[model samples]
Target chain A: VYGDLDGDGEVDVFDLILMRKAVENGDTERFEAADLNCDGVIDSDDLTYHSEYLHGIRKTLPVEY
Target chain B: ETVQISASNAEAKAGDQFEVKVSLADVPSTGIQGIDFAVTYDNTVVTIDKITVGEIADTKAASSDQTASLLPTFDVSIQNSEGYSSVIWSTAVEDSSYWISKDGVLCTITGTVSSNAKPGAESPIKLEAVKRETYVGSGTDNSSISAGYSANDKAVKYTVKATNGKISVPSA
Candidate 1:
């Protein structure tokens, strides 16, 4: 559910689009949640984290801080 | 006919927080295809943190099953500064099929009353529509709250009648 920004029960393109829009707007609850790394900010790193999780390059998503 | 967009009056004690809701009334059956305006407030009396999209223009999904919808291809942007907050949303010509035609809340602005706000005083919150040249963004689009039925290939540039409201600071 951490990567599921759109909450579609699965992390997918829809969620990615939502996250991208949130990042673009820079002001949304979803933007806050998209901070997978919990780094106090949402940026390209979070996007990479999401992609990694999707591609299974990283077995587990680092728990939100 | 004119579309009435009103800013609701609210009360907040010093150091208190509240939300100001901007809504629409007298919307025609053609519905609202797009809107552009800003909320102006007193920085000394209150500070707006952010604004939340309301039902009419919200595109977020309510749940997993229901797909997110509304102005599918339009951009909805909100900015909050010391004394000003603006909202600009419009549907693309190709995306006109997703226009909203119903009357409801357009957005909610959340902010806190400044601790130093003087009781018995009021901070005025007003809605001011942007002109074409002043429209926020790349400066190519015109500022207008468009309403029409795309089904009939009709678009009406109706006049916007904004009713400004204020935040009343009640005595402690």
Candidate 2:
């Protein structure tokens, strides 16, 4: 659930604001978490936005294995 | 002869769904009737979603009808609480004469990494040959239908070989 897009360690409403900002600015400075879908860029199509981590929707976290 | 199953190095995030294939090779074209396999993974890390037939086994000649074609009937079960998933698929070929003839894909499985999956945690995609399941017939051409008139003329030894895959953070 570390959608800590801003790297603050805590995933809160602030992270949501940052993700939305990154999506708008087309920021790709290794924003892995902010990129939500991991599609290289925060693309929106299905309306099923990937970063639900802020709302307790911790279904899409990244795995190392 | 020699059979190998391999999974892919899919880069995935928690909210991402990854699709990969498990294939059979070095199999005799002798009317491949069915296959049962267990693909093991750490369910605590990833979640199994769907399983379906791959094109490799779904073969048919041009200008052919249903019986002459290979139709797959499949069943899948996943135990997230435990840590394994099993997929079994049998084909309804018009005749025992219809062989999968060549080597290619077997099936495709799709899974989702838990949103809670910790980045840097890893899991392996393993193929288990535990069941000792067999081919439709004992004959090379699948000469007879087993459990009936064709009780597998002999026995086919299926050897399992595979390159284990990984589910983890993508350096990409």
**Maximum-TM-score candidate:** 1
In order, the first chain's TM-score in every candidate is 0.74, 0.62
Alpha-carbon RMSD, candidate 1:
12.7
User: What are the root-mean-square deviations of the candidates from the true structure over C-alphas?
Assistant: 12.7, 22.2
lDDT of 1 by residue, B111-150 (tens): 8898988879888888873322211122343344333322
lDDT of 2 at B151: 18
Evaluate residue B73 in candidate 2 and report its C-alpha lDDT on the 0 to 100 scale.
Answer: 39
Residues B37-152, candidate 2: write the lDDT tens digits.
56778877787888776766565521232312222134456656657675544333335544344567777879898877776777898875322212212122211111111112
Chain B TM, every candidate: 0.73, 0.70
Off by over 4 Å in 1: A1-65, B59-82, B93-97, B131-155
Over the stretch A1-65, how does candidate 2's per-residue lDDT look in tens digits? 33555453433323333443454456734466655555566543101232222212233354222
Of candidate 2 chain B, the 10-residue stretch with the lowest lDDT total is: B142-151
Docking class of 2: incorrect
What is candidate 2's CA lDDT for residue A21?
40
Provide the TM-score, chain A, model 2.
0.62
